[PDB]
Amino acid sequence: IFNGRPAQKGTTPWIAMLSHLNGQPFCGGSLLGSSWIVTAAHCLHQSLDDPTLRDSDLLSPSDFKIILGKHWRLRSDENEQHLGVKHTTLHPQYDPNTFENDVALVELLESPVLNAFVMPICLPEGPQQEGAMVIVSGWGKQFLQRFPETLMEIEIPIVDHSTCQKAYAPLKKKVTRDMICAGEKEGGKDACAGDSGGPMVTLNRERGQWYLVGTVSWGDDCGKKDRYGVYSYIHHNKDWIQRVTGVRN
């Protein structure tokens, strides 16, 4: 998280930390329903050798864990619930080369206890428009290659899909309909390494509920000018998420 402020304890009860059994964090996630964690697809598989992606390239459920109700990055409190992993399902049309449909679902081995510090995030019932303020949270890298002690967050606007697809035209990197971009044109506030799968949420001012718009995916470095952080469009593959999870708002 580039140029962010520390989130207050209990304001992001849906964020999940995908970490090794060692404890070192490597990705983020979001609690959906009662036992599902949505995250980036590239978080749940190793680098391709046979450059094609196979099921054996995936990360074994007995090789990493998910922590809920977590506030610190390396410290612990009584709210942390360490949960194993049962199943991992990446998007069927996910492309590791173009990061297309960079989204996946993690079926928890043990369901967490829903309390004021652990509760799911809602699903988007419709598309999102330009200029919508969203909150992106994570424990990833900061400026000058640093890491925080608590959860970090930024509030950035959603960039127009046309201007973002044209923003990556110099780098010959396509931006598909399953990707959504955020961040200011001057740079600065952006996600970075370790924030993948992290939540990009906003508030339904009518229902008074926060819901997930996207998950951190990729981008050109972290916080560069004339560049926007790219996130997986949750509304695009919401039916695939609902078809696999079954949970609903």
Partner: peptide, 12 residues
């Protein structure tokens, strides 16, 4: 460059 936002980042 264009890198994944994970740890480690899948840079390119």
């Amino acid at each position: 460059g264009i890198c994944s936002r994970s740890l480690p980042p899948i840079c390119i």
